[PDB]
């Protein structure tokens, strides 16, 4: 997250921290995700495409820090890793950039809701907020595009939804942006998601409830003029989500 503010997991208790085991035992952060039911985390296919083996991943819930434990956190293995069959990528755009992780602990349990671990509501079909609506993004992603490291503490910020029509302008992303994507950005381009925030939640209040409107998918650089963050438009994938969960 470029700009914005530091936060803790209580402010985004559906946030899932996804890591990968190596290859000699080191564990590195991969991407964010969102808990949509006790056993299911939703994220982006691009986070896993190159290394699709479920055994390689660890998921944490109730975690506020990257490399240190947080009191109340839960650690999970990935029972199933479901990537979208229609996924595709070019230099930039990732199409159908959506993934589901079925989570299970060593002891065979799913998530237990608490003050630090809660599910996030899915939107109703084809129902998004109007353009200019302020939404929140959360993650352990880079604080500056040039940074080598990720922040140790969870961050969040606010970005405003941009219309498909504005985002498809040539100076923005042209044809790269489809109707199954949502653009969002800061009016001054001063705050944004960035590398390492992929798979994480874009949350909007809809019909009075915090709703998973988007999943951080792609973009050119970060907090860059005329280059919004691009998000998988969750309201266009409800049949896929329902079937695979």
């Amino acid at each position: 997250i470029i700009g914005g503010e530091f936060t803790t997991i209580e402010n985004q208790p559906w946030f899932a921290a996804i890591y990968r085991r190596h290859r000699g035992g080191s564990v590195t952060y991969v991407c964010g995700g969102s808990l949509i039911s006790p056993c299911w985390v939703i994220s982006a296919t691009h986070c896993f495409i190159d290394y699709p083996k479920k055994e390689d991943y660890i998921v944490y819930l109730g975690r506020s820090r990257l490399n240190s434990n947080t009191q109340g956190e839960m650690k999970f293995e990935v029972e199933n890793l479901i990537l979208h069959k229609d996924y595709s990528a070019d230099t930039l755009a990732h199409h159908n950039d959506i993934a589901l992780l079925k989570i299970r602990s060593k002891e065979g349990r799913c998530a237990q809701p608490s003050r630090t671990i809660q599910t996030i509501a899915l939107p109703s079909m084809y129902n998004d907020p109007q353009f200019g609506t302020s939404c929140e993004i959360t993650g352990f992603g880079k604080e500056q595009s040039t940074d080598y490291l990720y922040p140790e503490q969870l961050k969040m910020t606010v970005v405003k939804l941009i219309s498909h029509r504005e985002c498809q302008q040539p100076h923005y992303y042209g044809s790269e942006v489809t109707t199954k994507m949502l653009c969002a950005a800061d009016p001054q381009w001063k705050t944004d998601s960035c590398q390492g925030d992929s798979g994480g939640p874009l949350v909007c209040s809809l019909q009075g409830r915090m709703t998973l409107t988007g999943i951080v998918s792609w973009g050119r650089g970060c907090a860059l003029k005329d280059k919004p963050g691009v998000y998988t438009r969750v309201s266009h994938f409800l049949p896929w989500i329902r079937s695979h969960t």
Binding site: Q195, D197, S198, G199, S217, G219, C222
Partner: peptide, 14 residues
């Protein structure tokens, strides 16, 4: 570069 962007996390070529 592209490897510093959203979209290329956990990629072999990066």
């Amino acid at each position: 570069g592209a490897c510093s962007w959203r979209g290329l996390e956990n990629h072999a070529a990066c």
